[PDB]
Amino acid sequence: RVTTAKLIYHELQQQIIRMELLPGTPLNEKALTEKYGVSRTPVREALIRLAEDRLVDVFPQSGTFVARIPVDAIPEAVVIRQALEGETAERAAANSTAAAIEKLDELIHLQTFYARKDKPGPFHETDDAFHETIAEIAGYPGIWQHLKPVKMQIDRARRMTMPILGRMEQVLREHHAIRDAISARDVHAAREAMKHHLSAVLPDIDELRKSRPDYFA
Numbered sequence: 001r002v003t004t005a006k007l008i009y010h011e012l013q014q015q016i017i018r019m020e021l022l023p024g025t026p027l028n029e030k031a032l033t034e035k036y037g038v039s040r041t042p043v044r045e046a047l048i049r050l051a052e053d054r055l056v057d058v059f060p061q062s063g064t065f066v067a068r069i070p071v072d073a074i075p076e077a078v079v080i081r082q083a084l085e086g087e088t089a090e091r092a093a094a095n096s097t098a099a100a101i102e103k104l105d106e107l108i109h110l111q112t113f114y115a116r117k118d119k120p121g122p123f124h125e126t127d128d129a130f131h132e133t134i135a136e137i138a139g140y141p142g143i144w145q146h147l148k149p150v151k152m153q154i155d156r157a158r159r160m161t162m163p164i165l166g167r168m169e170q171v172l173r174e175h176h177a178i179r180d181a182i183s184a185r186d187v188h189a190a191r192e193a194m195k196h197h198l199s200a201v202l203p204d205i206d207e208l209r210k211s212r213p214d215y216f217a
């Protein structure tokens, strides 16, 4: 069931994952309690969970702040995603009806629109929907829900790489490769195009760490 603790949690979590609250931004329990209009109790419960997510840092005699993106865990997150989304890609090709490909094409056209209009936020959200639909076609949409905590730090990094020149267009090219393989029912080609697409995050973060080292730790 929904509680104010879970609702505050998901709201704060989302703001951190979408880089609306940048790393180092303090979080004031007094100011949060006033904002939400509920007790100080559900605020504490949410901050505790966020700390376990490694999303916030509890500096004991200072306060809570938004944590930096841990670099050591990124490669393991890509492998897990390559494996799970490699699976959903394999199965989506096998279960490929034409009405499913239409659903993918509709989402690619929607991404193309956000790229044309240089709106990278909606571009990222339609990116998630594109992958969520691969999981629905494969028959295991829960695999997508399963990855949501895994790809938290990757999503923070990708929020910073999308505005870079030519990046959304590269994503669209990679998505076309994945769709074409699924439409062709090529189980191998689907897996490898998906695993390739997902590896693009690794060089980008190497660059970001040099560029903006205050966002990584």
Ligand SMILES: [Zn+2]
Binding pocket: 127, 130, 131, 171, 175, 197
């Ligand atoms: Zn994608």
